[PDB]
DNA sequence: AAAC
DNA sequence: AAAC
DNA sequence: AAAC
DNA sequence: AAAC
């Protein structure tokens, strides 16, 4: 017998509908398309973004980010994948990670949990890589779970927590920033030349602390470049950002005349231009919905830290341009701030930033997506968004905090035989 | 690599009309004949 | 809507029947992607090798390889590589028994 | 009742599609020419199954 | 040490190139469809042997 | 103190002579230049190739291949290198392989 | 001779290795032509029949 | 990536004349003053 | 029935 | 990483 | 002495 | 890897 040895590349329509729902600061997978080496991929996601009904009228738009990343399988199975491709037909089948027995416990990967409880490891691992390289704060430790079953029900069902949009309190300098540096000197002399050197080393430290915690950044610093293969990072193909809005619904009965309900319907469109897939992998598309971090009790630093010194009030450039990072507490910027919770700020930061003001009349008023009490906890707990901080904002519904109905138009120019080349023996 | 964001598609939402892509290609279903 | 039948010559006595059919796309709340729900992935399932797909018999699958409460005893024959020619719609589990959506629940 | 719009599960190949086909061979030889023929007949079967019922 | 410039003797096919391939058949029938498949797999083998190690 | 935090890229002349010798089918390193991330490298090797004196007159020309490859250190130290770059100044010094005690045993 | 490497951007720290290989075509003093050294010639060896090869 | 070969530099060999590149740049040696 |  |  |  |  002679067999159908070739195939000619033709457009494959892998389009599908997406019925989505998530929480406010959690990263969730909304679509995934497995890709073959050599195919060309393009997508047009067009749908509507809705928030759960809110308790009063619209006050603030939320921002939406949609991302499409490419994760080669090699990146996920390493050596094992390489060998699989080489071994070919009799390669040992690929490893499968374990989920918790519930229908929504793999939802973070945008999938229904199979009854067996396992999924392809590349689906779980790709997600972790995406999170650890673009979403955790550079200084937090990577998420290193071996199987989805190690996750809480909120991480598993809704996706991992993302950081807030940058603030003085939301984006402090990295935890271990040094506020001083000693040079061991001799008892009655200092080496003028060693001192010089001392400064050169701290420099190098300081840069890694503030801008280069990641290997890829250290190289760019040298003016070199590093491939996504060099540090195994998911490649960001496309990203769309938008503000979702809508309209208020006027109540009209005897008791609710003078009352409104904000309806957020936002038409959006996520377009990924054609992309050449160099090796077999998954194409992950994720969504993140967030509100600006408006707390109902943030104070202006100068208004809440006692008596004002010359250094704090004068705006003297020689001072600000030359002294160490300032360690501050949650109490210097918040009404119920824990004085025990510290953070390092740049000197003069208070003159480079302005907090939003929420009159005290709004403090526990439901229907506003404001953070009601200052985040309590370690630096990490304060920068990671907590979806419950938004519970009193919406009407209670089964579709969490936001829901979307999208049409994923996706075309892949792949080269596999026709469905009938496939079902015909000859 | 990623870039400009655009869900700013100014419009009232439209009910999802059809799960079949934009550009199709060869035939996918074989059922023994025509089936409406 | 508007249904227009252009002029038609009736060759012999008969009835002219006009019928309607209303349908929704078959979106199930629990369909899984074949590769995500049938165990460990072999070279034949994951690689997209055209010589393989272009040459082996139809693959017999069960309702369980593509559904969360699929009856493993209910089989069906699919074309090899079909999973790379098709994509199911995704319904987040938050919608599972939510009334008001025309989704197939089980 | 009408059928659903085509799916992987909604539009599977016809129920009796054969997944194999035997050619009764002799014990220590096969007829190179009969084999050829074997393939011609299955073809004809296969088409009626998939497209011409 | 490097290899010689290619020759009939200097550039033979890779050591383990198979000179035959068995398909385990049944005693008095062969599966016309399995045979087909048999060929698809060897193909894939053959290519890795000769050009893609 | 303020230190010399920058540098401006300028041409570095790393030219050198090479006095070589080898056997017939063996691959030998004739030059190596360590490169830093972000530099641009160019080379013009120009010399003469001689065979040992032969016993009779020329009969057949030999063929010569000269190759220049780039090998990133990451490729060689893997994870260890990545960490070294990140650790920076106090990184643990890089591993050193062992040779046989002879002058030409790393030739 | 002259070996010229056009400008090259070094993306990350590494070594630039330059190697030489000197070789002669593999002329053996005793190689025979296959057809002249393997016995009696069969139709398959001598005819150049494209369907066989 | 590598390509065309060229030691075919048609010429009689010339004695090596000078180990100093083609394009030089800044000063490298500091010995206290001029030294011939 | 994206067919020698 | 608004960089000698 | 490829120098504020 | 002078490749449906």
Any chain G CB within 8 A of the CB of H7?
yes
Q: Which three-class secondary structure string do you get for chain A?
A: CCCCCCCCCEEEECCEEEEEEECCCEEEEEEEEEECCCCEEEEEEEEEEEECCECCCCCCCEEEEEEEEEEEHHHHHCHHHHHHHHHHHHCCCECEEECCCCCCCCHHHCCCCCCCCEEEHHHHHHHHHHHHHHHCCCCCCCCCCCCHHHCCHHHHHHCEECECCCCCCCCCCCCCCCCCCCCCCCCCCCCHHHHHHHHHHHHHHHHHHHCCCCHHHHHHHHCCCCCCCCCCCCEEEEEEEEEECCEEEECCCCCCCCCEEEECEEEEEEEEEEEECCCCEEEEEEEEEECCCCECCECCHHHHCCCCCHHHHCCCHHHHCCCCCEEEECCCCECCCCCCCEEEECCCHHHCCCCCCCCHHHCCCCCCCCECCCCCCCHHHHHECCHHHHHHHECCCCCCCEEEEEEEEEEEEECCCCHHHHHCCC
Determine contact, residues A274/A410, Cβ cutoff 8 Å.
Answer: no
Chain L: bases < 7 Å from a protein Cβ = 1, 3-4
Residue nearest to nucleotide J4 (CA to C1'): F6
8 A C-beta contact, residue A159 and residue A30: no
Strand partners, C41: A94
**Backbone Cα Rg of chain A:** 26
Structure tokens at H6: 């060229």
Whole-Å CA distances, C90 to A109, A154, A156, A269, H11: 11, 20, 17, 18, 72
Angle at C46 between CA A73 and CA D19, to 5 degrees: 175
CA dist., res. B3 & res. A68, Å (int)? 10
Whole-angstrom Cα distance, residue A116 to residue C97?
21
CA–CA dist A362, A372 (Å, integer): 9
* CA nearest neighbour of A398 among B7, C36, C101: C101
Q: Give the span between the Cα atoms of A221 and A207, in whole angstroms.
A: 9
Burial of A49 (0-12, 13-18, 19+ CB in 10 A): buried
Total domain count, chain A? 1
Chain E residues whose CB is inside 8 A of the A5 CB are 43
DSSP-assigned letters across all residues of C2-61: ----------SS--------------BTTB--HHHHSSSBPHHHHS--HHHHTTSPPEEE
Secondary structure of residue D36 in the 3-state scheme: helix
Q: Kindly determine whether the C-beta of residue B32 is less than 7 Å away from any atom of nucleic acid strand I.
A: no
A370, burial (CB in 10 Å: exposed 0-12, middle 13-18, buried 19+)? buried
What number of CA atoms fall less than 13 Å from residue A419's CA on the CB side? 22
Residue with tokens 């890694």: A208
Q: What is the C-alpha to C-alpha distance for residues C47 and A38, in angstroms, rounded to an integer? A: 12
Q: How many degrees, rounded to 5, is the angle at CA A402 between CA A282 and CA A61?
A: 110
Closest by CA position to B30, among listed F33, C50, A419: A419
- Who's near C32: CB < 8 A, 6+ residues apart? A111, A112, A114, C65, C66, C67, C68, C88
A43, A272 contact by CB (below 8 A): yes
DSSP code at position E4: P
**Cα D27 off chain centre by:** 25
User: What letter does residue C78 receive in the DSSP assignment?
Assistant: E
Element (H, E) at G16: strand G14-23
- A112 CB neighbours strand I below 7 A: no
DSSP 8-state symbol, E10: T
| CB atoms inside a 10 Å sphere around CB A189 | 7
Q: Would you say A355 and A168 are in contact if contact means Cβ atoms under 8 Å apart?
A: yes
Contact C56 E39 (CB under 8 A): no
Rounded Cα–Cα distance for residues B23 and A335 (Å): 58
**From CA C35, how far away is CA C32, in angstroms rounded?**
8
Rounded Cα distance between A421 and A4, Å, is 8
Structure tokens at A75: 């990146």
Distance CA A415, CA A69 (A): 22
Separation in Å, CA of D12 to nearest CA in chain C: 6
Distance from CA of C78 to the nearest CA of B (A): 10
What is the spatial distance between Cα A365 and Cα A59, in angstroms, rounded to a whole number?
13
DSSP state of C93: G
Q: How far is CA C88 from the centre of its chain?
A: 8
Q: What is the tally of helices (H) and strands (E) in chain B? A: 0, 0
SS3 label, residue G17: strand
DSSP track, chain F:
-----------------------SS--EEEEEEEE-TT-EEEEEEE----PPPPSSS--S--EEEEEEEEEEHHHHHTHHHHHHHHHGGGPPPPP-----SSTTTT-
Structure tokens at A45: 């996601």
Token code pair at residue E10: 């200097």
Give dist(CA E31, CA D38) in Å, integer.
10
Measure CB to CB from residue D3 to each of B28, B33, B35 and give the nearest one: B35
Q: Round and report the angstrom distance from CA (A4) to C1' (I4).
A: 15
Residue D9, C-beta contacts closer than 8 angstroms, at least 6 positions apart:
C31, C63, C66, C67, C76
Structure determination technique employed: X-ray
Identify which of A29, A105, A71, A22 has the alpha carbon closest to the alpha carbon of residue A408: A29
Please report the sign of the dihedral spanned by the C-alpha atoms of residue A338, residue A342, residue A346, residue A348: positive
Tokens 């967030």 appear where?
A290
Integer-rounded Cα radius of gyration of chain F: 20
Q: For A333, what's the count of Cα atoms within 13 Å in the CB-facing half-sphere?
A: 26
Phi first, then psi: what are they for D43, rounded to 5°?
-55, -55
CB contact under 8 A, E36 and A5: no
Render E6-25 in DSSP notation, one character per residue: P-TTTSPSPTT--S------
Residues of C in contact with A20 (CB under 8 A): 90, 92
* Residue G48 contacts A where some CB pair is shorter than 8 Å: no
Strand pairing report for A118-120 and A96-98: antiparallel
- Beta bridge partners, H25, equal none
CA–CA–CA angle A398, A404, A405 (5° rounding): 110
Resolution in Å, one decimal place: 3.0
Q: Answer yes or no: do C52 and E40 touch at CB < 8 A.
A: yes
Cβ neighbours, 10 Å, residue A252: 9
Q: What is the CATH number of the domain that holds A133?
A: 2.60.169.10
Residue E51: count of CB within 10 angstroms of its CB: 8
Q: Work out the minimum CA distance from C37 to partner chain E, whole angstroms.
A: 25
Q: Do C93 and A403 form a contact (C-beta atoms < 8 A)?
A: no
CA dist., res. A374 & res. A338, Å (int): 8
C90-91/A16-22 β-pairing: parallel
CA distance from start to end of chain F: 46
CA distances from A368 to A249, A297, A365, A393 (A): 16, 14, 7, 5
Neighbours of chain A (3+ CB pairs under 8 A): B, C, D, E, F, G
Measured CA H4 to C1' L4 distance, in angstroms: 33
Cβ partners under 8 Å of residue C66, min gap 6: C31, C32, C34, C37, C88, D8, D9
- Per the rule left: phi > 0, alpha: psi between -120 and 50, beta: everything else, C4 is beta
Using a 7 Å CB cut-off, which residues contact strand K? F 10-11; H 25-27, 33-34
**Contact call for residues A70 and A273 (beta carbons, < 8 A):** no
Q: Are E31 and D21 in contact (CB under 8 A)?
A: yes
SS3 content of chain E, % helix, strand, coil (to 5): 35, 5, 60
What separation, in Å, do the N-terminal and C-terminal C-alpha atoms of chain D show? 21
CB contact under 8 A, A88 and E32: no
Question: Do the Cβ atoms of A34 and A279 come closer than 8 Å?
Answer: no
Measured from the CB, is D39 under 7 Å from any atom of strand I? Answer: no
Q: How many CB atoms lie within 10 A of CB F33?
A: 16
* CB contact at 8 A, D46 and A425: yes
Residue whose pair of structure tokens reads 């539009």 in the numeric block: D11
CA distance A322 to F2: 11
Angle (CA) A92-A94-A98 rounded to 5° is 135
E4 and G CB contact within 8 Å? yes
F82's tokens? 């990545």
Write the burial class of residue E28 (CB in 10 Å: 0-12 exposed, 13-18 middle, 19+ buried).
exposed
Range of the domain at A27: 1-426
Q: Give the separation between CA A19 and CA A48, rounded to whole angstroms.
A: 10
Do the beta carbons of residue C104 and residue C26 sit within 8 Å?
A: yes
**Tokens encoding A126:** 């790709």
Q: What are phi and psi of A270, to 5 degrees?
A: -105, 110
Q: At what angle do helices E32-50 and D32-50 cross, to 10 degrees?
A: 100
Instruction: Give dist(CA F12, CA E43) in Å, integer.
Output: 53
Our measurement of the distance from residue C27's CA atom to the centroid of its chain's CA atoms, rounded to an integer in Å, reads 9
Q: Tell me whether C21 touches chain D (CB under 8 Å).
A: yes
Residues counted in chain D:
53
Considering only CA atoms, which of E43, C65, C5, D16 is closest in space to residue A114? Answer: C65
| DSSP one-letter code for B10 | -
End-to-end CA distance of chain A: 9
DSSP B22: S
């Amino acid at each position: 017998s002679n067999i159908q040895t070739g195939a000619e590349r033709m457009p494959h329509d892998l389009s599908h509908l997406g019925f989505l729902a998530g929480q406010i600061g959690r990263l969730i997978t909304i679509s995934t398309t497995p890709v073959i080496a050599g195919d060309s991929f393009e997508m047009d996601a067009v749908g509507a973004l809705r928030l759960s009904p809110l308790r009063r009228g619209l006050a603030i738009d939320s921002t939406v980010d949609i991302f499409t990343f490419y994760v080669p399988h090699r990146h996920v199975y390493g050596e094992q994948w390489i060998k699989f491709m080489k071994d070919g037909v009799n390669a040992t089948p690929l490893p499968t990670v374990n989920t918790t027995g519930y229908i929504d416990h793999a939802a973070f990967l945008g999938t229904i949990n199979p009854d067996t409880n396992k999924i392809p490891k590349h689906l779980f691992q790709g997600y972790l890589n995406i999170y650890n390289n673009y979403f955790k704060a550079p200084w937090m430790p990577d998420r290193t779970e071996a199987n989805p079953n190690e996750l809480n029900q909120d991480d598993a069902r809704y996706g991992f927590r993302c950081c807030h949009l940058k603030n003085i309190w939301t984006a402090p300098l990295p935890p271990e920033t040094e506020l001083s540096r000693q040079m061991t000197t001799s008892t009655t002399s200092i080496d003028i030349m060693g001192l010089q050197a001392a400064y050169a080393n701290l420099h190098t430290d300081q840069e890694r602390d503030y801008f280069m915690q990641r290997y890829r950044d250290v190289i760019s610093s040298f003016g070199g470049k590093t491939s996504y293969d060099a540090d195994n990072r998911p490649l960001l193909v496309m990203r769309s950002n938008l503000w979702a809005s809508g309209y208020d619904v006027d109540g009209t009965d005897q008791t609710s005349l003078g009352q409104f309900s904000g309806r957020v319907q936002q038409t959006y469109k996520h377009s990924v231009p054609r992309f050449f897939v160099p090796e077999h992998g998954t194409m992950f598309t994720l969504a993140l919905v967030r509100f600006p971090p408006t707390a109902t009790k943030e104070i202006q630093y100068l208004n809440a830290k006692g008596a004002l010194t010359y250094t704090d009030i004068a705006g003297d450039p020689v001072l600000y341009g030359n002294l160490p990072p300032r360690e501050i507490s949650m109490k210097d910027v918040f009404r119920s701030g824990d004085s025990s919770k510290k953070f390092k700020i740049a000197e003069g930061q208070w003159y480079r930033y302005a907090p939003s003001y929420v009159s005290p009349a709004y403090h526990l008023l439901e229907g506003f997506p404001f953070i009601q009490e200052p985040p309590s906890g370690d630096l990490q707990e304060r920068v990671l968004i907590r979806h419950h901080d938004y519970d009193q904002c919406f009407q209670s519904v089964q579709l969490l905090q936001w829901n979307s109905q999208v049409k994923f138009n996706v075309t892949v120019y792949r080269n596999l035989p026709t469905t009938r080349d496939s079902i015909m023996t000859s | 690599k990623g870039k400009k964001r655009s869900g700013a598609r100014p419009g009232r939402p439209q009910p999802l009309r059809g799960t079949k892509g934009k550009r199709k290609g060869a035939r996918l279903w074989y059922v023994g004949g025509q089936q409406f």
